[PDB]
Amino acid sequence: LMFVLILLNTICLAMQHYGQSCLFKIAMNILNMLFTGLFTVEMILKLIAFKPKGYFSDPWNVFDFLIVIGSIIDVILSETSITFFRLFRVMRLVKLLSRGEGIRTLLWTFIKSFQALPYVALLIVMLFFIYAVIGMQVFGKIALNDTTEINRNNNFQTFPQAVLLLFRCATGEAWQDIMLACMPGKKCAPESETEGETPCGSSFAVFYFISFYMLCAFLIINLFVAVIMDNFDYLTRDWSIL
Amino acid sequence: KLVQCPPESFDVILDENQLEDACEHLAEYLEVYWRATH
Amino acid sequence: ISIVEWKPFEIIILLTIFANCVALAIYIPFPEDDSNATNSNLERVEYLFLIIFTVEAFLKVIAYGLRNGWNLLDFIIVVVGLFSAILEQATKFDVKALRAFRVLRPLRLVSGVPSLQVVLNSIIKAMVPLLHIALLVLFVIIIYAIIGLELFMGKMHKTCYNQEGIADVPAEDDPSPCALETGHGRQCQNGTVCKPGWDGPKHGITNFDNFAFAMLTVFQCITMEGWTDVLYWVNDAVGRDWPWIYFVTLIIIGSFFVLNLVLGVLSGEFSKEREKAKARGDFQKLREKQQLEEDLKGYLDWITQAEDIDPRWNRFCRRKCRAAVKSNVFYWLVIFLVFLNTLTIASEHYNQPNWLTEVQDTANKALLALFTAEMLLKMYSLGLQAYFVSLFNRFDCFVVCGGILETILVETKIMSPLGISVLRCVRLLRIFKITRYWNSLSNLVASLLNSVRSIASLLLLLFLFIIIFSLLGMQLFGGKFNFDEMQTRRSTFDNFPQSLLTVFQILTGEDWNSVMYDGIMAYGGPSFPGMLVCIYFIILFICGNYILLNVFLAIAVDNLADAESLTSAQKEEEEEKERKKLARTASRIVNDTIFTNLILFFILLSSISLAAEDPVQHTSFRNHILGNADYVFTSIFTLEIILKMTAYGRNYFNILDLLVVSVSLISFGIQSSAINVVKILRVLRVLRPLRAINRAKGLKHVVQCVFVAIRTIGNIVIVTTLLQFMFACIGVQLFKGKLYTCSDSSKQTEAECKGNYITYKDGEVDHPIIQPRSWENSKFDFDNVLAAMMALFTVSTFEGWPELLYRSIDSHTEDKGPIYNYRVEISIFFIIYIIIIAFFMMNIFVGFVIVTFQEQGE
Amino acid sequence: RICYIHKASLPRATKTCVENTCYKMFIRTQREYISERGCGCPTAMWPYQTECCKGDRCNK
Ligand SMILES: CC(C)CCC[C@@H](C)[C@H]1CC[C@H]2[C@@H]3CC=C4C[C@@H](O)CC[C@]4(C)[C@H]3CC[C@]12C
Ligand SMILES: CC(C)CCC[C@@H](C)[C@H]1CC[C@H]2[C@@H]3CC=C4C[C@@H](O)CC[C@]4(C)[C@H]3CC[C@]12C
Ligand SMILES: CC(C)CCC[C@@H](C)[C@H]1CC[C@H]2[C@@H]3CC=C4C[C@@H](O)CC[C@]4(C)[C@H]3CC[C@]12C
Ligand SMILES: CC(C)CCC[C@@H](C)[C@H]1CC[C@H]2[C@@H]3CC=C4C[C@@H](O)CC[C@]4(C)[C@H]3CC[C@]12C
Ligand SMILES: CC(C)CCC[C@@H](C)[C@H]1CC[C@H]2[C@@H]3CC=C4C[C@@H](O)CC[C@]4(C)[C@H]3CC[C@]12C
Ligand SMILES: CCOC(=O)C1=C(COCCN)NC(C)=C(C(=O)OC)[C@@H]1c1ccccc1Cl
Ligand SMILES: *[C@@H]1O[C@H](CO)[C@@H](O)[C@H](O)[C@H]1NC(C)=O
Ligand SMILES: [Ca+2]
Incomplete structure (x- = not known):
């Protein structure tokens, strides 16, 4: 019954379109209030049944407890904003996912294998940090032109921005365009101080953007295969046998 | 005929698929056997 | 009639199936009910084909009274073909759009060949273990679509509209979302006003207005194609503070974790199949x-x-x-x-x-x-x-x-x-014979030549899939990508070769969202019936990527495992031979525990220090603290080495520590030419994070493991480099000095392309603009070998490769401009390079890593 | 003779030179900046381009 209630709540959340009428909005608000009341009723039923010690023993309960309390006080701040507090309703859908013995076992085993190897990812973290710092030092002064690949959204002028640029290149979005935009001969930052018309940029960009791609691909494959070999017992199980 | 029967008779056995090392196998046995009766 | 059903009647029908597949390729979908003589003949040929597959289903129907899936497909194909022909003649809803069933006829080429049916069954039976991952992907997509609905619902509908009216998007040719003075996003500024009311970034297709639209956007982002565009649009809309937490997390969870799960499950299934088929002893035949x-x-x-x-x-x-x-x-x-x-x-x-x-x-x-x-x-x-x-x-x-x-x-x-x-x-490549691993490369080639039959079967099934989807796309979007825009689309479905190129490009996943948008706008716009056509692109992408994985990973894993087993057996036999041959012929507080830590903490603090610098502003108060903070940091490491240098006299990591500290100390001075030398030893300050190795156990272990893996895979790297160099030489021969073009399309030489010429804004004849004529080269050309190696690398990364492909297709003669669709047959070069390098070599490398990790440990 | 000459890239300083052909060197994407000037019709490497002339001080 509560699985069906969660499904109904998710369906109710899934039909908040753009330009909805006032009646639709009021109905959605009152339906959300009804659902959060029902879930508070379940929570009260299971503090009694399970006592205040047995409730906060299953980790699926403390997560559930934190979800609903973020929905009770969500209504308090709604009648009179912050958008963070309405995301708790969606997070409850993971209980449906964590009910099949296959997906649960797969996710749990892979998460444990990920935890058991914390340095194979530290290698990628170190590579990203080193290349972000090098990019900040080298290409960190180029002008932000909205018609070029170095602009407000994509640049080397900050460590988070450099890391985001490297992440985008690792995904492989327009890394060749960024490399071509980092070549020498670009008018750049007016806030840095003649003969210097376009003296910044570098020919190091080719090696930078090629070596980063090779190293990132190699390290990602290394992490993937390490996790797979750590979890290989579950991947070749022969479930028919004991 | 000379395979299914036990080796026994062959004091030394040449097992090589090339002329080069086959020559060295025969020469190895003859040289050591050469020093036996001397 | 049960007599003539086993004689070469079944090969006559197979040849009939092949000629109803070489008649759906010759067909040219013309815009707006146009046609020619070849089509006029193909209609009658299809009438004859319909007659043949009718009296051949009747014989089997009145011979055995429709249970097998293949015969059911036969029956349904025949009935819908007859229905479509009868309705078309009667009307002589869309009539002609019911002919999409005719592209299922090539699917019968595997029902008449059981040797292909077995490989199709092998590919299909690997789908069952991946259904859990599919369900997880669906759940993640739903959750992120709902979150995007709750976050960015209808917030990307305002663009700069200029302070003279609301005529049309006077903000470049690519308008972007903005925000008001009370907003946090992008500000138009100058002679522009952020006015509400605007279709959207992609004609209203890419947004989180609806649940369906949000789901489509989330799927497109998860495919890792054009997700930065959506992220930047959201940044311009709501602000540049918290959409990265959404998009980066979505990319990490739905694209890298999911890919890891898929690879693990597929590798496990392949290993189980290998261990089940090894019992028969297929390796023995290769061994003997x-x-x-x-x-x-x-x-x-x-x-x-x-x-x-x-x-x-x-x-x-x-x-x-x-x-x-x-x-x-x-x-x-x-x-x-x-x-x-x-x-x-x-x-x-x-x-x-x-x-x-x-x-x-x-x-x-x-x-x-x-x-x-x-x-x-x-x-x-x-x-x-x-x-x-x-x-x-x-x-x-x-x-x-x-x-x-x-x-x-x-x-x-x-x-x-x-x-x-x-x-x-x-x-x-006999230079490997002098060195080692020559018995690891030649064994791979021997296994490839031994399994070439299954390799050809697997590569033929993929070709059949591509042909079927190309025919379906030619039917759906044939002659429809003709809108009033001045630029003509190059990735269309007008011909059969063009449809094949488009389907291959979508399979590689590069710019597939652009083709999806073209297909969506060709059927109207962002509306319920029109936008249902994106299912074609979604299914094509998913199924093609899955089939490519199941083919190119199976081939690599099986062949590499066989080669490794061959090498192991050969090494054992050599050891036994050289052993039996020999068995006869012969007859100071720096060594503390807490200190060390405290200084690996300092090391972490020092690494944090230079990440917080100001890259652009040379003089800033934040760098006043950081610049003088490194001074005390360098003192601690200087004291650490002196306190240790007396204990001993040297390993390889104390050398790195010295190379860090001495460079820092000399960089504290230098003076003189503080332009070039300082800019080298300032970037040489990136070695401080590397000092965590030899100071944090486990980091050294993983670094050593990665070095061993590099030394193991160097042979595959060298072979891939050799193949890339050879392909670069071939490309230099093919397209040397041919990829030049002029801004004016009417001039085909450097001398002619000089001066100014008149352009029109959006092709409006009433708005002429003078622009200078320029003789330009391609971004990535083939002028010499070095310039071709990098172009081929970028092609292998599937980045901007359609642009290079369509630039190379037009090239015809050295020192002269392009000609529209001159040599469409030159795309075979790019297709072969992608298949051999970007699909076979990469999966061979991944399978080699998997096998070298499996034969270690266990 | 004196068509704008150089060997390096940063200062753009002249040099001795002959021959009736003088050129410009620039990046294809960054068209509006001449990286290098000299004489002859040399071959660029990447991503540079060459535009040669016929008279003295044609490259400008
Ligand atoms: C599994 C289902 C229930 C999840 C949610 C899907 C349904 C409820 C969604 C998806 C498509 C949506 C519709 C698509 C388009 C529009 C046009 C708009 O001007 C008014 C809302 C309206 C009519 C939407 C209402 C809600 C809608 C029908
Ligand atoms: C190719 C394989 C998958 C079999 C073919 C299935 C697809 C392509 C077929 C089956 C059902 C068909 C549709 C049935 C009904 C309609 C509505 C009509 O107003 C236009 C044609 C249209 C839209 C057809 C187009 C083609 C179609 C979608
Ligand atoms: C890719 C194959 C194997 C499976 C997916 C089937 C595709 C090709 C089918 C299924 C549903 C179909 C759509 C159903 C309805 C419409 C609305 C109509 O006004 C134009 C055609 C259009 C838009 C169809 C186009 C073709 C379509 C998308
Ligand atoms: C695990 C390790 C590698 C994590 C390293 C995190 C460090 C390098 C990151 C995390 C938070 C970051 C800071 C977050 C915010 C800002 C404000 C910005 O205007 C300048 C950069 C600055 C000051 C960042 C500097 C680098 C920083 C300190
Ligand atoms: C023997 C194999 C492995 C390597 C061959 C290397 C030699 C022959 C190749 C590699 C790169 C080539 C260069 C690439 C580009 C340029 C720039 C231009 O001025 C034309 C000649 C020149 C200078 C080429 C000369 C030949 C060259 C140096
Ligand atoms: C280690 C990964 O390097 C790559 O990403 C390669 C790409 C791009 O990745 C392919 C993505 N499909 N393009 C080319 C051609 C490659 C190259 O120059 O080899 C030296 C490398 C590569 C290197 C070693 C082994 C395999 C590959 Cl495929
Ligand atoms: C950089 O931005 C300025 C600002 O308008 C613009 O004038 C200039 O043309 C841009 N650079 C290039 C190469 O277009
Ligand atoms: Ca791409």
């Missing part, structure tokens, strides 16, 4: 084949030379020939000759000096004559047929035959195929 060939030439040469020792004059004719080939001097001389051939082939470039083009044509003939003479010398000294017995000797014979064929032309056109001298570089 190698030794039967090793002793073959080892006994044939014994027979050959013993004839020459004699009992007509062969005593003074044969000893030198076989004693020169095996002299170890002929080997190095031939290696040097091949190196010279590579040198002269790779020295070609655009606009070369006139002496070089004569040197590299004289040397080509000289080396060709020398290699022909060597081939003829070797051809008789080791038997005419025993020379043909060897593997690489067949490659040499084919290379000589092709070179002699293409060097005598000297009168005909297109001498690009004359450069098959580049495959002579494969002959120098």
Whole structure:
């Protein structure tokens, strides 16, 4: 019954379109209030049944407890904003996912294998940090032109921005365009101080953007295969046998 | 005929698929056997 | 009638199926009910095909009274074909759009070939373990779609509209979302006003307005194609503070974790199938084949030379020939000759000096004559047929035959195929024989040639899938990508080759969202019936990527495991042979525990310090603290080394620590030319994070493991580099100096493309604009080998490769401009390069890593 | 003779030179900046381009 209630709540959340009428909005608000009341009723039923010690023993309960309390006080701040507090309703859908013995076992085993190897990812973290710092030092002064690949959204002028640029290149979005935009001969930052018309940029960009791609691909494959070999017992199980 | 029967008779056995090392196998046995009766 | 159903009737129907597949390729979908004579004939040919597949389903229907899936497909295809023909004749909803069922006929080419049916079943049966991952992906997509609905619902509908009216988007040709003065996003500024009311970034297709639209956007982001565009649009809409937490998390969870799960499940299934099929003993047949060939030439040469020792004059004719080939001097001389051939082939470039083009044509003939003479010398000294017995000797014979064929032309056109001298570089791969791992590369080639039958079957099923989806796309979007925009789309479904190229591009996943948007707008716009056509692109992408994975990972994993088992057995046999041969012939507080930590903390703080600098502002108060904070940080590490340097006199990590601290200390001074030297040793300050190694156990372990893996995979890296160099040489021959273009499309030479010319904004004849004529080269060209290696690398990364492909298709002649669709047949070069390198070599590398990790540990 | 000459890239300083052909060197994407000037019709490497002339001080 509560699985069906969660499904109904998710369906109710899934039909908040753009330009909805006032009646639709009021109905959605009152339906959300009804659902959060029902879930508070379940929570009260299971503090009694399970006592205040047995409730906060299953980790699926403390997560559930934190979800609903973020929905009770969500209504308090709604009648009179912050958008963070309405995301708790969606997070409850993971209980449906964590009910099949296959997906649960797969996710749990892979998460444990990920935890058991914390340095194979530290290698990628170190590579990203080193290349972000090098990019900040080298290409960190180029002008932000909205018609070029170095602009407000994509640049080397900050460590988070450099890391985001490297992440985008690792995904492989327009890394060749960024490399071509980092070549020498670009008018750049007016806030840095003649003969210097376009003296910044570098020919190091080719090696930078090629070596980063090779190293990132190699390290990602290394992490993937390490996790797979750590979890290989579950991947070749022969479930028919004991 | 000379395979299914036990080796026994062959004091030394040449097992090589090339002329080069086959020559060295025969020469190895003859040289050591050469020093036996001397 | 149950008599004539087993004779070559079943091959007559197979040939009928092949001619109803070479009649759906000849068809040209014309815009707006146009046609020609070839179509007028194809209608009647399809009438005949309909008659044939009707009286052949009737015989089977009235022979056995529709249970098997393939026969059910037969029946439904026939009935819908008859229904469509009858309705079309009666009307002579869309009538002509019901002909999409005719593209299912090529699917029967595997129902008549059980050898293909078995590989289709093998591919299909691997889907069941992946259904859990599919369900997880669906749940993640739903959750992120709902979150995007709650976050960015209807917040990207405002663009700059200029302070003179609301005519149309006066903010570049690519308008972007903005925000008001009370907003946090992008501000239009100057003579523009952020006015509400606007379709959207992609004609209203990419947004989180609806749940369906949000789901489509989330799927497109998860496919890792064009997700930064959505992220930047959201940044311009709501702000640049918290959309990265959404998009980066979505990319990490739905694209990397999911790919890891898919790879793990597929590898486990492949390993289980391998361990089940090893019980039969298929490896034994491959194992017994190698030794039967090793002793073959080892006994044939014994027979050959013993004839020459004699009992007509062969005593003074044969000893030198076989004693020169095996002299170890002929080997190095031939290696040097091949190196010279590579040198002269790779020295070609655009606009070369006139002496070089004569040197590299004289040397080509000289080396060709020398290699022909060597081939003829070797051809008789080791038997005419025993020379043909060897593997690489067949490659040499084919290379000589092709070179002699293409060097005598000297009168005909297109001498690009004359450069098959580049495959002579494969002959120098015997340099592996002197080194190690030669028994790991040749074993791979032996396994590939042994399994070439299954390889061809797997590559043919993928081709059938591509053909079916190309026909379906040609039916759906044929002649429909013709809108009023001034630019003409290059990735269309107008012809069969063009549809094949478009489907291949979508399979590679590059710019597939652009083709999806083109297909969506071709059926109206963002509306419920019109936008349902994106299911075609979604299914094509998912199924094609899954099939490519199941093919190119299975091939690599199976062949590499077989090669490794062969190498292990050979090593065991060599060990046993050389053992049995020998068994007879013979008969200071720096060594603390907490300190160390405290200084790996300092190390972390020092690493944090230089990440917080100001890259652009040379002088800023934040750098005042950080610049003077490194001073005290460097003192601690300076004190650490002195406190340790007395204990001993040196390992390899104390050297790194010294290289860090001494560089920092000297950088504290320098002075003088504080422009060049400082800019080198300031970037040399990136070695501080690397000091965590040798100071944090486990980091050293993983670094050493990665180094061992690099040393293991260096051979595959070298082979891939060699293939890339060869393909770069071929591309240099093909497209040298041909990828030039002028901004004015009416000028086809550098001299003509000079001065100014008139352009029109959006092709409006009433709005002319003067622009300067410029002779421009491609972003990635093939002028020389070095410029071609990088272009091929970017193609292998699937980044901007359609642009290069369509630039190369138009090129026709050196020093002249492009011609629309001149050589569409040149796309085979790019297709082959992508298949061999970007699909086979990468999966071979991944499978090699998997196998070298599996044979370690367990 | 004196068509704008150089060997390096940063200062754009002249040099001795001959021959009736003088050129410009620039990146294809960054068209509106001449990286290098000299004489002859040399071959660029990447991503540079060459535009040659016929008279003295044609490259400008
Ligand atoms: C599994 C289902 C229930 C999840 C949610 C899907 C349904 C409820 C969604 C998806 C498509 C949506 C519709 C698509 C388009 C529009 C046009 C708009 O001007 C008014 C809302 C309206 C009519 C939407 C209402 C809600 C809608 C019908
Ligand atoms: C190719 C394989 C998958 C079989 C073919 C299935 C697809 C392509 C077929 C089956 C059902 C067909 C549709 C049935 C009904 C309609 C509505 C009509 O107003 C236009 C044609 C249209 C839209 C058809 C187009 C083609 C169609 C979608
Ligand atoms: C033997 C194989 C492996 C390597 C061959 C390397 C030699 C022959 C190749 C590699 C890169 C080539 C260069 C690439 C580009 C340029 C720039 C231009 O000025 C034309 C000649 C020149 C300078 C080429 C000369 C030949 C070159 C140096
Ligand atoms: C890819 C194959 C194997 C499976 C997916 C089937 C695709 C091709 C089918 C299924 C549903 C179909 C759509 C159903 C309805 C419409 C609305 C109509 O006004 C135009 C055609 C259009 C838009 C169809 C196009 C083709 C379509 C998308
Ligand atoms: C695990 C390790 C590698 C994590 C390293 C995190 C460090 C390098 C990151 C995390 C938070 C970051 C800071 C977050 C915010 C800002 C404000 C910005 O205007 C300048 C950069 C600055 C000051 C960042 C500097 C670098 C920083 C300190
Ligand atoms: C280690 C990964 O390097 C790559 O990403 C390669 C790409 C791009 O990745 C392919 C993505 N499909 N393009 C080319 C051509 C490659 C190259 O130059 O080899 C030296 C490398 C590569 C290197 C070693 C082994 C395999 C590959 Cl495929
Ligand atoms: C950089 O931005 C300025 C700002 O308008 C613009 O004038 C200039 O043309 C841009 N640079 C290029 C190369 O277009
Ligand atoms: Ca891409």
